[PDB]
Amino acid sequence: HHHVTNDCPVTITTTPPQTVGVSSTTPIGFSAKVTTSDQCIKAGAKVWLWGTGPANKWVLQHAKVAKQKYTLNPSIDGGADFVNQGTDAKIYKKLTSGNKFLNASVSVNPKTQVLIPGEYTMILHAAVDFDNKQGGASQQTTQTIRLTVT
């Protein structure tokens, strides 16, 4: 029903960098949150979050060794959805004035997923879809989540 004349921002935050010991058994949480401007929410903006893995799953990737990685399936807030009823892990949410954030998280369980020392990064992509004067448009950005082991 509405279009904007300044493109919607895509505003993502993530968990700050974490450090853990190789022998820790505690679950490690990582989360991301996406929003946009109040005017874009009024206009009907839809925000997105996705990873770089198969089916847009989130990948915690060792800096040195290509094959060392964990592909993680996200959990999302109750107002968000997965693409195609969950056949893909890409996430979207139509924001509203009473519900302004898309929130999602993953977890590494050291008990089932072995912890190797070193640096890990996890790339997340976020976007916002809206209409401007030329019709459908989107802006996207990226942020990298970090984990240091031992």
Q: Which two tokens stand for residue 9?
A: 């921002």
State the DSSP H helix or E strand holding residue 39, giving kind and residue range, or none if neither.
helix 38-43
Cα distance between residue 14 and residue 17, in whole Å: 9
What determination technique applies here? X-ray
**For residue 140, what are the contacts with CB-CB under 8 A and spacing of at least 6?**
10, 48, 125, 126, 127, 128
Cα distance between residue 86 and residue 24, in whole Å: 32
Per-domain boundaries in the chain: 1-150
Q: Which two tokens stand for residue 41?
A: 């929410």
- What are the beta bridge partners of residue 149? 20, 118
Q: What is the resolution of the experimental data for this entry, in Å?
A: 1.5
- CB distance 2 to 17 below 8 Å: no
Domain 1-150 indexed as CATH 1.10.3720.10? no
Q: Which two tokens stand for residue 146?
A: 């970090």
- Supply angle C-alpha 85, 102, 18, rounded to 5: 110
Residue 86 gets the label, from left (phi > 0), alpha (psi -120 to 50) or beta, of left
